[PDB]
Design a binder for these strands. Sequence first.
RNA 1: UUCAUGCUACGCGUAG
RNA 2: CUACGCGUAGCAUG
Lengths: 117, 132, 929, 73
Amino acid sequence: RSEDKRAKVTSAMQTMLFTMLRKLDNDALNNIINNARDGCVPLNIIPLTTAAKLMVVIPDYNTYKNTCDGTTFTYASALWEIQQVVDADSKIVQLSEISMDNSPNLAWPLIVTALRA
Amino acid sequence: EKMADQAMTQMYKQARSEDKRAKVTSAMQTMLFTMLRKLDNDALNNIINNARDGCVPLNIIPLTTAAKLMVVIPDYNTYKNTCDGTTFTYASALWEIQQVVDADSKIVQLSEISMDNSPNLAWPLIVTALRA
Amino acid sequence: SADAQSFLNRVCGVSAARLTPCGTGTSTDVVYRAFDIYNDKVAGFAKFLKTNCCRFQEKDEDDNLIDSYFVVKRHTFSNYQHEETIYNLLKDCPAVAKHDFFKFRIDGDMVPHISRQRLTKYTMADLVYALRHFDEGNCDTLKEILVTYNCCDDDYFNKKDWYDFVENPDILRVYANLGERVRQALLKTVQFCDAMRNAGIVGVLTLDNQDLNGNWYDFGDFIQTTPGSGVPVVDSYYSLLMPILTLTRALTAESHVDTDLTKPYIKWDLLKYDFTEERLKLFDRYFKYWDQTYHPNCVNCLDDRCILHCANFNVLFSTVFPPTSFGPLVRKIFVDGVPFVVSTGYHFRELGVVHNQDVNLHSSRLSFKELLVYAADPAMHAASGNLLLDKRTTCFSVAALTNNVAFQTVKPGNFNKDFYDFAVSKGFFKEGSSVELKHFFFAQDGNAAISDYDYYRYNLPTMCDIRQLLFVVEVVDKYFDCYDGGCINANQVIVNNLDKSAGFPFNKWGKARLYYDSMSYEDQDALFAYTKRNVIPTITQMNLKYAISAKNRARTVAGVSICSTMTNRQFHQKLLKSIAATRGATVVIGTSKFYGGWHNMLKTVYSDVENPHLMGWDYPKCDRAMPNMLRIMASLVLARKHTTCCSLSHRFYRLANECAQVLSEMVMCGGSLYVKPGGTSSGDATTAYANSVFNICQAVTANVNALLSTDGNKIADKYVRNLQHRLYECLYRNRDVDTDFVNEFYAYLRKHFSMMILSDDAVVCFNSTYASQGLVASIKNFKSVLYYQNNVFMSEAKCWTETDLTKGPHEFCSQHTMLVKQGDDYVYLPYPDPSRILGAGCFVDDIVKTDGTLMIERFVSLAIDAYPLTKHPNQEYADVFHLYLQYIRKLHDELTGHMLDMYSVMLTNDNTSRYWEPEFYEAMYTPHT
Amino acid sequence: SKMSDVKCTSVVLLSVLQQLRVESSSKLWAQCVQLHNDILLAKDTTEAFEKMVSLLSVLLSMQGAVDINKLCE
RNA sequence: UUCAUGCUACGCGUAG
RNA sequence: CUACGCGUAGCAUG
Ligand SMILES: Cc1ncnc2c1c(I)cn2[C@@H]1O[C@H](COP(=O)(O)OP(=O)(O)OP(=O)(O)O)[C@@H](O)[C@@H]1F
Ligand SMILES: [Mg+2]
Ligand SMILES: [Mg+2]
Ligand SMILES: [Mg+2]
């Protein structure tokens, strides 16, 4: 009975590792691996430069005007276009109902989602 | 006799666990309103009796000296119970009325509220007010 | 007088400057400058009276008072010739404040003056002392320093809690405005040390001879040697200035291009991790003549004291280098074709750049050990997960692992109504009664988990004083000599709670039982030897705790992943089970309060202290604001037992495993990894023991600071005078462990500052005559050391002092105490707060423990914890135990009634007759069992 | 007391609200726990009762949740 | 929904 | 009859 439990957690770890290797980018990641002069790259620069998408969680309207202004914003020296804005209730928020007037009506914080351009 | 003691106590423990787990919602609400009627505050029993006969708020009752309070009024006898002129006795504080919105969402004035217009009024009434 | 107005003319001299006669026309007694001296009368870093100075003050155009003074020393001519001999060999260096030597007839004698030029109002030692011996009422010198250097206007000080770091963290910005002032002083120290090397002069450099502009002055205590061979002794200088170098962040200007504060940040190559060349460049620029070998990467370290030494410098030097450089180091390995990207390294902020050495390129299979190392790695999770810009925190986010952010809410407590009705029927909670419900389950909103994660912003880079830390690490390890530690093999690890969650991602598949039962013992031993050779980074799924509190703050539990627990247990559990089974030591973790244990605790603290008071304290944000240096120092002290079972590189990779799994770590706070700037994970193995070593380090550092804060001229005792003198010797003058003096200072702090520590809360029993003189620590010394080392302010409100021993600690482990009588003996009984016990009775976290008749053993344990309330003089408290006793009575009554109504009458009734009888609860405090 | 049973009433009131899935609205639940955590940290009685009025009104805004017509008796 | 400690309560194994 | 280990639950402390 114990070795079946070992077998299922081996299969689950191999499954999640293989799915998360086919989830990660292999063009920008291989570019920054081969750019590394010794092949060794800090981990907290892997998602900053090879992200599929960005999530910005915005607590109030002031930090929304300072970062995710409009429909296309810049973070991490790259151009991100706002693919979606979702509030704290996991409900969709379109870009027109975010304003200084409507900011007491939004379920803050807002989870905007942006793809890399 | 000995083994059956621990057997019956474990089955009794599982029975009382499922007994408390099953009626987790309705008994808690009866217990809530039990100790609300035990409190005997005039503001609290005001809110409970107004929500009894139908007068139900639509938002949070505020604490600001001036903030907005939406509340349903179903009919006219409750309106006589709560509205005396331009005031609104509710939650043991005076609420000053400023507009009344009917069921088809039109601004209704205080002057046309009487017995004769009441069958023509689109009930309920969504009024709004400010604290005194 | 003509004499004073002629002297004020002569001190001007060649450099034309309008002056105002500060002080009087003779030499001016200063208002207590702090000094750093060692000569045959005194030793230490204290406040003295500089009586020989004749301080002046410059006047500019239109008569304003400037921060530019002429300290004029009157000293002997046999020193004056020596002064001018040295200054004529340092005259071209710009880090020497000019000196203007002459002699002048004050009484008709031509007394020689050293009429120095353009020194500030204060010296560096005043800044270091004021920021380091910080007293919330007496901090006038710190206010003058922050005002005269434009760090904040004088109306900043009328703010409530202007000095605190926990409230008002704008004081970090106010202090950081001194950062270029301190850095410019460090550059002047290196110019001065270069010039006094090249002139070949030898002497110790003390903080007190350096002003705030940087310019060094005092040229006594210097001896001339051959030029090119001179050496300056800057061990006390740089050591005493080390907490200020990150309190005021003196190396933020190193993170600009050309190191100019107007110019932009350095756009570092975002792939560059190995900053070893820039670390050595910083150390050759600032700490140049610091004559102990600095290793940037701490893998090249020679023992534990060298790890603390070099990590102390990397804590300062890693504030320059960008936070996208640290954390793990990943390399795209290949397993059987498919490319993994796993972490084969770690760039610690403290332990340098640490590379793995069992890195496998081109693996063909993965065993269970290697799957744990690769899944516990943050490498996969931050590579596959998508980028996060979290504006809720200041803490540096890295990634996010779900498509959306999970919000965690803490429920309210399932209110036990039956006990509350039984509490009001037996007469509690009346008007004005002193036992009222102060303890509740405070419910939380959605963003509470991240708002409580963000309390790691209280943590900071802390460069500890390294000579103090390298002596108090020896005194702390002298407090841990009664224990036996070492590596245990996988079969010797006792795990008490197997059914607990095993961290991320391992709680997606089972509990910790799954991994201790799936792995064989050889797999666990091989994983521990992997960590003996390799750093592995991990994840703490930082979840919210659902517990009774008297405050509305959410409590987080940082449940570390099982690759951290099942190796920290094998590395540390022998020392932890030895501390948890050694009675009567300083550290009392494992000593039960029952069975007369609290009384033996208290009579062990009272072990022959001469004029014994008591004193407690509490650390504000101990888990969040603990520095990195003190947590790796505590991991080293817990790893000084491995002198035979480990090598030294084994001890370094196991330290770096503990640092990458506990201290600086990828932490998952609601579906999205962040970097944690330090502190302690509370789900750590050694979380009560490294907290305890931290606690002894703060206490011993308070005693070291207090014994060197005293004059030494003003100590009538001479044994503690010649223990202060060897404290300054063994601290700032001797490299190796002077073990005779570490034994003496440990015997001193076991005599006069006897201690008791169950991990965060401490009760000492200090000799109050010495703390009245300052020869052990008062509360003001703990407040100062908490300020400059732990980076928080510890108020006088949360620190007590019980004068009479007979009333014991006011609180230890949130247990008050009393002195009551049983069997013709006055024993100590520990009693809790009565609101806590009534809040635990009235409020239950589950619904199953409300009316499922499980409550018997609950209220039996609450009554065991609430028996010593019945011996209290307040009958209102004393009725709490009888409330629980009659409530267990009513519970057993309704239990027997419902069991009779269901099947039949009970027969084993005499097992429960002891439950509502206080025979059972008094026998839990009689010391015979 | 009055203080003690208004604190216990706020505890059981927010347990009733959390039973009725007010966690799903983030703003309304943040208001509910702000009212509750200001009740339990209250040393005055009247301001505890006015925030109790506010929190119970947040319960009573849900019409189809608690059948108050049959539950008062 | 963590780590470490102590104590209860409930069923077992060992010895005297 | 007694103490010591084991498993579960519960409570308190850090
Ligand atoms: C491992 C672990 N597991 C669960 N709980 C833990 C720990 C550890 I290590 C500390 N604790 C908690 O510490 C609280 C009291 O201390 P407390 O809440 O007052 O800390 P603090 O907020 O920094 O102090 P201040 O109030 O002055 O700010 C107390 O529930 C509990 F002990
Ligand atoms: Mg708390
Ligand atoms: Mg505190
Ligand atoms: Mg506190």
